[PDB]
Amino acid sequence: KEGYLMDHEGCKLSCFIRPSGYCGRECGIKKGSSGYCAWPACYCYGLPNWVKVWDRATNKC
């Protein structure tokens, strides 16, 4: 599964002025296989199906 990671508040995880590879790391902590800064937010590939990703409809940010 792919999508934007969220923080604890339901906001997309920002990658404004982060080092390169930040989003790949954060995606990997959630067991994703790849990620990148889809500026301004981290986007992941290869997440297991149980991982919650951002959804605009239900956003709480």
Q: Are 12 and 37 in contact (CB under 8 A)?
A: no
Say what the alpha-carbon torsion angle 53, 56, 57, 60 is, to the nearest 10 degrees.
Answer: 80
CA distances from 29 to 13, 34, 54, 58 (A): 13, 11, 16, 24
Overall number of domains in the chain? 1
Read off the amino acid at residue 12: K
The whole-angstrom separation of Cα 52 and Cα 17 is 25
Domain membership of residue 20 as a residue range: 1-61
CATH for 37: 3.30.30.10
Read off the amino acid at residue 59: N
Tokens representing residue 36 in the block: 């990148």
The whole-angstrom separation of Cα 61 and Cα 49 is 22
PDB resolution in Å: 1.2
Determination technique for this entry = X-ray
